[PDB]
């Protein structure tokens, strides 16, 4: 795939392409790689669609139940439930996931779970097949505490590149903005992100 | 010998002694509850009794949030209520995961009544001394109110009441659906349906309530939530300024 | 006592195998007692799989090279004295 | 048929599980123990009776700690306190392992609640012989809970249980009356020591050591340390002054 | 492998069975009765895997001596056969499969006829006038095709048997060190110990 | 078990002398089975049940006297033993072996005294080419016994006497069909015997060759042989 | 793949005297071509006047020494502080080693 | 007369709040011989009175080694101690293998309490019926514990359990400030343990076969003296 | 002990069944435990297979969990092997086996219900069965169970001939129920189902002419009132 | 080596005017070596016929098994089992061992006694039901038979005609097949009569 998540002044923003390929064939060119495990805790999926789907499905539950009993879940916790699944099942999974969410205390929080099952908290994180090409662009163009539209742009560019250079990435660019004021889903089309 | 009084087996007249007793336990708390349907809401009022000045009212609740959509209010000893609520909070999370839609009020009830039934047929486990009143605004049926009892029975009510002065409250409601000849309370905003539920309970119990003697649960589409200390005082203030 | 003996003959050969020596009379005796010490129908902690105290007493007598010639009284209760 | 009280799961003719009510009697006949919720934590206190002169001073600890941030104290059959606190920790560590955050007080309470309540379900296991007072500091401040053998538990501003139950409960209500905003972390400790010293007149036959622990967001940065040395004498000497 | 033969005539069944036991490089025994008696009128010759061979035939011997003793009835050949088959078919999708091939021959005391059954390690069972396992069949089936009549006296059939063994000693690379010929008829199971020079 | 007595057994052994009444007669060239039906209501559906005469295999069949729901639990497992002895030896199961197989499960409770004995007593009628036609009996005692003619259930002690009287070894099959009905003259609490209080069965030397047909009678076929005397 | 075995090298020698016995080993512990320690002992006192050495793969030998040193603690408790016959410890070690027969302690081992 | 309805098993609470089946077990202690335990700041001693059957029989051992740093004595039901002394022997030997750490005495107390407690929750099983005096030198000094079958384990300077336990329990109660100051002396702390167990004898006379002593601390590993080894203290 | 369960069956609302030439009919009353309760939320007449329905008398809950366990056994033990649905005779057998095991098993009481199971299989035609707590089961031309058991059973002998059209048996089973009725008598307190012609109307799809739809049809609150006026 | 191709043999089934036919070769051989020429691949259970090709010890095992299963259907269900039904029992039955299959290629053929309708169907080793109006083939001459049938078949053949047709399809495929032949048998199944003819063919 080709996915990333960025934090800022007002919260966190998730971004992804929409291209799941089996082989050289684009089996679906409109994939929703931004998946929701709670009001304001979402993930970015990459790796086996069957594996990332199954996991997020199983985390959506653990957290619906955690809410039932114990209350609203820290973004930190969502991450721990992901790691526990990915690590304790490493031998049989191929999934790299980015968990991102907004609470009121910390605001923007982002956790990247590589293949191993390790967990790494970061200001922003990139992953998925086409990430390799933007480690350069991102490290140079990222800043802390960006404005909302500053961050949308940072993501639009980063992902415009990843898709240019990756054959396993493409489609439309989906975003999901997570702030106090709510959940806003974004979409940018090819006629737009290519001309950058 | 005379030990068909101690386990869930048949007395000589086809009676389950242990279940009949289990019912008698649901009053042991001495709280009364009622539930109503709106044009598109559902409301449950329960009493809150905090005798010990050492208690923290905020932790004293017989109203449980089972899911996003589904609320439950129990008449019965606290320990048993929680044993049931925890099991429902989990039968409904499992239901969503396995089957792909939120768990519907009447299905959760059939599943707890089925459970409540096993207790009624197995020697070694005892029923619970609780009467679970389930509410929601289920996406197919509308406002729902389904009640299960230690007997294993469940059924759906226009409105209902449970506990010690159950029949005084019940007979008040009966005489107000004999009179509007419908299956609900024709008011739009849930606020007026909460006021109505408190009104017809003051009327039936012959005592006034303060913001501290009541617990209110409410179900609209897409949410079930409980009213805070103050969210009730507002409801009471409005009753008093028309009555 | 058929079973009580089977366990003692089995314990004594089992020891000879694992250790290349004849088994101490004291310990052969205690092993037999540790068998009738599994009396019961309900045990939590460690399980004692059987049904009733073992209904037979034993006089056990033999020779090891540590403690000369020996005589022992094994009781159904699982304890013993060296008379 | 009769015989409705020899079996544990069994409902009396009017809704009561008698074996539980008997266990509460074992609670009432044991050491007296309390808890106080102050403005940023909780303070715990227990009465240690002194059978003979040969019991070693300061060296038979009754207050148990759960995780790092939670305190438990119980009154009654002591070994049942331990068996309960053990299951208490297995639970608090299941929680941490999976959800990373250390278990929230209210969620911890619900977990003990279900263990205890589940010991009131079958004729073949007896209820716990302890009322347990426990609490600590979580993401949203301080919480004090108490949990009787029936499975009942609620959150208290203060709580007591033991022989000196009615006596402490009454001095406890006195503070909630004078200071509605809660005591200071330090003051709550001085006072808990008073309250134990008093509820001892209901057992004044034998002698006793005091034992205090606390969990304060300001005085032990959220953790559950014991009260020792100078600060313990601070309070032992404050009790002597309000007993005379 | 390892010579397993058998021919069913008019009044009996005849089983030949190589006498040699070879362990890779050396011939260990020159006198192996490769057959267990399953009961008065039922014989089973066998060859195949090393240890798997005997251990099976003996398991069958036990289980048939047990049905014999229990119902004090001599289990019929058709049945002993269809049982041995199922016991092989069971072990073919098992963990370690019995790798054994067998010839069952015996006299059905109730039809007063002789019967010869051929079963391979897979559970493949068919009834025959003559049969063989391993490669034994290639050199000998061409002769039987030609010289076999089903009305053959027990004597006429021993002759034809010697003729097959002779061809096997001529065009077969293995030194199998002879055969043991056993005969099964109304009177039971007897062994001809005068064969490599009759 | 005080004096050498099988109590929980006699309990059910005499609970048998209450329900049902069944008969078996072995002729020289056939076998016969027969039973009376439980206290019938007008509205009970006669033709369906075959409630006390069950087929076990194409060559074996049993008459029941006892609790129905209890025998079905047995028969179900006996119809299976039949088929296991087929799939296994590719020959039809021999009667005694099937009988013993049940008798051994009956006695299985007559000893592992942690579950309750069996109602039910069986007459078995079967043919196998080792022991011609056979007739067997099965009380929950665990014992089985050979019979040229037999009976179980209420009024048992009585029919055993008429049977002993009219039986001859040279008997044909049709001769034994009568003897069976005839002697449910007496042993009938219902004054007058109808085709609907009955259930019948035969294992003959085939309707053709030297082989073995089996025949559970349809109601009409009974009212037809009842015609020979009983009622007309 | 994962390969659960090693070579740590070293070299041991045991000699039986008339009224004595010596059991010698080098102190070098290696992995491939690098050196791990120059002092990490190979030869151990096990009590009851028995010295042993489990040489080859350290983790497996270290673990086998631990497990026998323990077999001694329990032959004591179990048989009233009796001395372990040299010949008997040998046999107990056979049963220790053969226990993991199908996943052996990769050690040539001398007592 | 006066029957009891709530003393049937262990899963049954008496109306006054009492588990009778446990109180009965706590009494089995007193059905076995007397043993004594005491400790200075540097040592812990045990004295037991082994009891015999005939003049013609051995004496029951009453002290059992647990690790080189911890041991216990039993008064009461023997098999119940064989079962508990063994469990202790394991944890001690597990704290050694996994963590290479002498198992704390304060902790084996906590561990036995919870082991015995299990036998008072369960229907079917009877409680443990033996008392244990446990001694050891851990990272935190000398130590003595009393284990009653109720689960209640308590740490002391000295105590005594069993048949006429009361003679010594009262001696030690008065000797207190004297013997806990017997540091650096081993022979003298045993002289005291023995002068205390002998308050619990009638006209009865300690011999080489009656007496069983054990000791442990600082630089003395748990050793047991039976037979002639005990003569020097008589 | 089985005897005591049959006793819980003997009280508890009356229910009945009548087989005809071209259909079967089963009905009971819906006694409202209150007027506040909406009686449409509980079904005393439940579908087991589209060719088979059931009604009871006795303990409500024990029926529910028996209707559930019963639907499942229809798949697990028949449909998933032979591709067809089970025949009335055999599905009934599998329910009796279910209840007969609650009897002979330890730690459990038998069920407090007698069941009337009605249905049609291609080879055995129509049939109506009764199943008791004992695990015994009997085939009926018509019968009743529960309180009104004796009154109604006698009325059914009086009124039943083997030439009834299904519409005649609906008519009967309404009268029969009118004499016993405890509460009010309309479409809101009567539950009636039939096992008649194939209802293609109710299949949910159209395109394979080999499967033609449910024989089991549960009469609506309206269809009942309509028959009670011309009654 | 290949299980379907060790013993070999073929089986074929067709429909006609109110009738059906099923046929096979009598060959059983280990690889190249022919062992028996009297090994029939077609079995019957009541009025429903089942031909099975492939591995002998599994062809045999499945007969032994369906006899069992259908014998109990007769006793428990009070009737003889129908073809449509038995088909569905072979599917679910084969698919039971999905990950360790019986290496067989079953063909069901017979006439539904209530509706009088002719019925044939075939399966793969894990139970896919190929129901077909025309014809079903199976074996080591899967291909050859498909070739013959596709040409020689017309629907609604009278029985005495459909024998000639099915015989010629079978015969001429097995002659172009190394692992099939050595005899042949052909059941013709009318609504109540069933005739079983053996055939004359080369023997190589």
mmCIF file of N, CA and C in Angstrom, chain C residues 15-24 26-28 64-67, chain G residues 71 75 78-80 82-85 87-89 91-95:
data_model
loop_
_atom_site.group_PDB
_atom_site.id
_atom_site.type_symbol
_atom_site.label_atom_id
_atom_site.label_comp_id
_atom_site.label_asym_id
_atom_site.label_seq_id
_atom_site.Cartn_x
_atom_site.Cartn_y
_atom_site.Cartn_z
ATOM 1 N N UNK C 15 13.949 -47.744 40.769
ATOM 2 C CA UNK C 15 15.066 -47.069 41.404
ATOM 3 C C UNK C 15 16.382 -47.702 40.952
ATOM 4 N N UNK C 16 16.386 -49.021 40.814
ATOM 5 C CA UNK C 16 17.582 -49.745 40.418
ATOM 6 C C UNK C 16 18.004 -49.363 39.012
ATOM 7 N N UNK C 17 17.024 -49.061 38.172
ATOM 8 C CA UNK C 17 17.280 -48.629 36.804
ATOM 9 C C UNK C 17 17.870 -47.224 36.757
ATOM 10 N N UNK C 18 17.158 -46.271 37.349
ATOM 11 C CA UNK C 18 17.576 -44.875 37.368
ATOM 12 C C UNK C 18 18.876 -44.610 38.138
ATOM 13 N N UNK C 19 19.319 -45.553 38.975
ATOM 14 C CA UNK C 19 20.457 -45.284 39.864
ATOM 15 C C UNK C 19 21.517 -46.383 40.071
ATOM 16 N N UNK C 20 21.338 -47.552 39.471
ATOM 17 C CA UNK C 20 22.359 -48.613 39.517
ATOM 18 C C UNK C 20 22.717 -49.043 40.942
ATOM 19 N N UNK C 21 21.701 -49.174 41.785
ATOM 20 C CA UNK C 21 21.901 -49.579 43.167
ATOM 21 C C UNK C 21 20.574 -50.057 43.717
ATOM 22 N N UNK C 22 20.628 -50.919 44.729
ATOM 23 C CA UNK C 22 19.435 -51.349 45.450
ATOM 24 C C UNK C 22 18.867 -50.173 46.232
ATOM 25 N N UNK C 23 17.551 -50.121 46.336
ATOM 26 C CA UNK C 23 16.888 -48.983 46.945
ATOM 27 C C UNK C 23 16.774 -49.105 48.456
ATOM 28 N N UNK C 24 17.117 -48.036 49.174
ATOM 29 C CA UNK C 24 17.031 -48.019 50.640
ATOM 30 C C UNK C 24 15.701 -48.528 51.208
ATOM 31 N N UNK C 26 14.316 -47.820 53.980
ATOM 32 C CA UNK C 26 13.571 -46.688 54.506
ATOM 33 C C UNK C 26 12.752 -46.031 53.390
ATOM 34 N N UNK C 27 13.372 -45.799 52.234
ATOM 35 C CA UNK C 27 12.709 -45.081 51.143
ATOM 36 C C UNK C 27 11.749 -45.954 50.344
ATOM 37 N N UNK C 28 12.009 -47.251 50.291
ATOM 38 C CA UNK C 28 11.048 -48.155 49.665
ATOM 39 C C UNK C 28 9.784 -48.163 50.484
ATOM 40 N N UNK C 64 19.819 -52.725 53.588
ATOM 41 C CA UNK C 64 20.668 -51.861 52.804
ATOM 42 C C UNK C 64 21.968 -51.602 53.570
ATOM 43 N N UNK C 65 22.994 -51.094 52.893
ATOM 44 C CA UNK C 65 24.325 -51.039 53.500
ATOM 45 C C UNK C 65 24.581 -49.795 54.347
ATOM 46 N N UNK C 66 23.664 -48.836 54.298
ATOM 47 C CA UNK C 66 23.738 -47.685 55.188
ATOM 48 C C UNK C 66 23.327 -48.045 56.610
ATOM 49 N N UNK C 67 22.051 -48.399 56.734
ATOM 50 C CA UNK C 67 21.445 -48.724 58.013
ATOM 51 C C UNK C 67 21.068 -50.205 58.088
ATOM 52 N N UNK G 71 19.730 -32.840 40.682
ATOM 53 C CA UNK G 71 19.370 -34.236 40.904
ATOM 54 C C UNK G 71 20.002 -34.726 42.188
ATOM 55 N N UNK G 75 18.343 -36.217 45.687
ATOM 56 C CA UNK G 75 18.670 -37.563 46.115
ATOM 57 C C UNK G 75 19.021 -37.495 47.586
ATOM 58 N N UNK G 78 15.418 -36.887 49.391
ATOM 59 C CA UNK G 78 14.677 -38.144 49.164
ATOM 60 C C UNK G 78 15.249 -39.428 49.812
ATOM 61 N N UNK G 79 16.553 -39.458 50.088
ATOM 62 C CA UNK G 79 17.192 -40.637 50.688
ATOM 63 C C UNK G 79 18.095 -40.301 51.874
ATOM 64 N N UNK G 80 17.620 -39.425 52.759
ATOM 65 C CA UNK G 80 18.325 -39.062 53.995
ATOM 66 C C UNK G 80 19.821 -38.760 53.811
ATOM 67 N N UNK G 82 22.113 -39.313 51.871
ATOM 68 C CA UNK G 82 23.022 -40.349 51.322
ATOM 69 C C UNK G 82 24.001 -39.859 50.238
ATOM 70 N N UNK G 83 25.205 -40.436 50.209
ATOM 71 C CA UNK G 83 26.207 -40.047 49.209
ATOM 72 C C UNK G 83 25.877 -40.679 47.868
ATOM 73 N N UNK G 84 25.982 -39.897 46.796
ATOM 74 C CA UNK G 84 25.696 -40.407 45.467
ATOM 75 C C UNK G 84 26.872 -41.196 44.893
ATOM 76 N N UNK G 85 26.710 -42.518 44.828
ATOM 77 C CA UNK G 85 27.727 -43.416 44.288
ATOM 78 C C UNK G 85 28.162 -42.840 42.949
ATOM 79 N N UNK G 87 29.087 -44.364 40.380
ATOM 80 C CA UNK G 87 28.449 -45.221 39.409
ATOM 81 C C UNK G 87 26.963 -44.931 39.253
ATOM 82 N N UNK G 88 26.355 -44.364 40.290
ATOM 83 C CA UNK G 88 24.906 -44.107 40.286
ATOM 84 C C UNK G 88 24.593 -42.787 39.612
ATOM 85 N N UNK G 89 25.479 -41.814 39.765
ATOM 86 C CA UNK G 89 25.288 -40.535 39.098
ATOM 87 C C UNK G 89 25.464 -40.726 37.602
ATOM 88 N N UNK G 91 24.668 -43.395 35.881
ATOM 89 C CA UNK G 91 23.386 -43.899 35.406
ATOM 90 C C UNK G 91 22.274 -42.849 35.422
ATOM 91 N N UNK G 92 22.321 -41.923 36.366
ATOM 92 C CA UNK G 92 21.248 -40.940 36.443
ATOM 93 C C UNK G 92 21.406 -39.965 35.310
ATOM 94 N N UNK G 93 22.651 -39.702 34.944
ATOM 95 C CA UNK G 93 22.964 -38.840 33.808
ATOM 96 C C UNK G 93 22.529 -39.480 32.485
ATOM 97 N N UNK G 94 22.723 -40.792 32.335
ATOM 98 C CA UNK G 94 22.192 -41.513 31.182
ATOM 99 C C UNK G 94 20.713 -41.214 31.042
ATOM 100 N N UNK G 95 19.973 -41.290 32.141
ATOM 101 C CA UNK G 95 18.524 -41.052 32.083
ATOM 102 C C UNK G 95 18.172 -39.581 31.865
#
